[PDB]
């Protein structure tokens, strides 16, 4: 910031192979990585989950790789996502949700495992339960119609060498189309 600018820490749309994000507990209905398309019609890695019929009360977790924070005291996280209208999903029931919750946890090295940091608030720091202003609709026989949602969250103040972001779903039906972490330098 001898020249002032925003500096990227992570941009999923630039991943050319697979993201390798870690999921838990890896049961039926788990988060799945899928190839999607961005605004330039280029292939990008995305994550989807839609466990609304079988077990809408089962939590499904998704964790990023470890992100070294460099000088950053606050980091911004821009999330772009589709959220299905519960009423469009056949045999979704009363338990279906139209939100997901975003957490982070700071660590001094990339020490996470399949089971740790423990998959729960504390250690994870709850940032926001994110609502969707735009619901995607699908009517029998027809193409889905909808808009993409965007939410930017501010994380910090940060003090350890790096951090993980984690997403908790429980009975929602959504596609995480992109994550971009950046800070002001």
């Amino acid at each position: 910031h001898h020249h002032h600018h925003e500096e990227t820490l992570l941009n999923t749309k630039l991943e050319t192979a697979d993201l390798k994000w870690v999921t838990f507990p890896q049961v039926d209905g788990q988060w799945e990585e899928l190839s999607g398309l961005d605004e330039e019609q280029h292939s990008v890695r995305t994550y989807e989950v839609c466990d609304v019929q079988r077990a809408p009360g089962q939590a499904h977790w998704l964790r990023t790789g470890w992100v070294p924070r460099r000088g950053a005291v606050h980091v911004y996280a821009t999330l772009r996502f589709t959220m299905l209208e519960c009423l469009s999903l056949p045999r979704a029931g009363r338990s279906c949700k139209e939100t997901f919750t975003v957490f982070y946890y700071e660590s001094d090295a990339d020490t996470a495992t399949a089971l740790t940091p423990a998959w729960m608030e504390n250690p994870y720091i709850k940032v926001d339960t994110v609502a969707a202003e735009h619901l995607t609709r699908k009517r029998p026989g027809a193409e889905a119609t909808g808009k993409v949602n965007v939410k930017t969250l501010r994380l910090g103040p940060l003090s350890k060498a790096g951090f993980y972001l984690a997403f908790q779903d429980q009975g929602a039906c959504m596609a995480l189309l992109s994550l971009h972490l950046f800070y002001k330098k």
Binding site: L34, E48, C50, P90, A144, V148, A175
Partner: peptide
């Protein structure tokens, strides 16, 4: 406007 995959858990809802 890409919203979700033809091959994922969302598509499987129908």
């Amino acid at each position: 406007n890409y919203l979700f995959s033809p091959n994922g858990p969302i598509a499987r809802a129908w």
